[PDB]
């Protein structure tokens, strides 16, 4: 929850032991009280300008949550926070050395370093590992 946005990547993994600062917990403690049924204690009393906007607000709260669970769901990394993969890093993506990425770098600058290359990494996890391991697992159950 953005408390370490000026910290470094080699140090922000220390405070990330809290559940991304209880990231998703702020949603459930919100939608317990977003679903205060005073909206149902009125039926909004009409259709109003705000309730049009709240309806377009809750949808984005639904969709953009799902696009982050699905991508974690497909990567063999459902529900975890720090998982490793089988994909080898290609040095053509970034010729930065080891410590400069971790000890000597922010996060948002590192986004603009590989925002070009990000989409290639997405395919190169699924079709390289999570499509792939499931067949090789199923072969190991053939016996």
């Amino acid at each position: 929850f953005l408390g370490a946005a000026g910290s470094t990547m080699g140090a922000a993994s220390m405070t990330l032991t809290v559940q991304a600062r209880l990231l998703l917990s702020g949603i459930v403690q919100q939608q317990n009280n977003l679903l205060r049924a005073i909206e149902a204690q009125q039926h909004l009393l009409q259709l109003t300008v705000w309730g049009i906007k709240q309806l377009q607000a809750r949808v984005l709260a639904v969709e953009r949550y799902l696009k982050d669970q699905q991508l974690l769901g497909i990567w063999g990394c459902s529900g975890k926070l720090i998982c490793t993969t089988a994909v080898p890093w290609n040095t053509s993506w970034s010729n930065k050395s080891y410590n400069q990425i971790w000890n000597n770098m922010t996060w948002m600058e590192w986004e603009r370093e590989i925002d070009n290359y990000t989409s290639l990494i997405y395919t190169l996890i699924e079709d390289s590992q999570n499509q792939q391991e499931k067949n090789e697992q199923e072969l190991l159950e053939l016996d």
Partner: antibody
Amino acid sequence: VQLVESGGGVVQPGKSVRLSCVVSDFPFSKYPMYWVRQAPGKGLEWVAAISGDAWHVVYSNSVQGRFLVSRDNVKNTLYLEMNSLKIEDTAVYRCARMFQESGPPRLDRWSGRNYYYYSGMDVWGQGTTVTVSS
Amino acid sequence: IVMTQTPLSLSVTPGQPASISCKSSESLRQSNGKTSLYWYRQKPGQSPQLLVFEVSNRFSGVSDRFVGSGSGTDFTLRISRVEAEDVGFYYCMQSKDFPLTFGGGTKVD
């Protein structure tokens, strides 16, 4: 920066030479290149283009299949090899850099196909000249 | 695609404004949000130099009196108070797709 060529001159039909454009200071693997052909007393004709990673090559239809281009990002060179020469290829060749920077290839999600962006030119080399005659 | 221009010869003297337009067959508007038409100038006996890259922006070492505009098909480059060293040619160059062509190059004396 500095941008010239080499290997120019005059040859016969059916021959084959290769020029050599050399850049000076900018990071050469970052940028794509081009080739243009100004005929004497005429306008300009586009010839060729290479990607920055030397993977994408697009030729003109008239000189399709005959010529050859390549890169060497370490040696910062730029080659235009040519084959099956004709007399109407006698003109001024110019080495030229893209104006903007280019990125890496894009890979649209919906179809597994990359995309190399291509935009026009700012730095024309003064260029050699090849003449095809007897 | 095809893209020619007009007029070929404008033999003038300094002190007056004029304009050179390049006419487009295929309309140009790429999906990035811009129209890839590049206007630039050679001198006689010289490799050319960039006047303006886009029809909006300019390049370094360019006088302020070099203005350009146009629709997706109409395209116009206007030179206010045409300067004494405006000799040579003026090519209109597009960058839609391949093969990317040119104009003939309008001679200005």
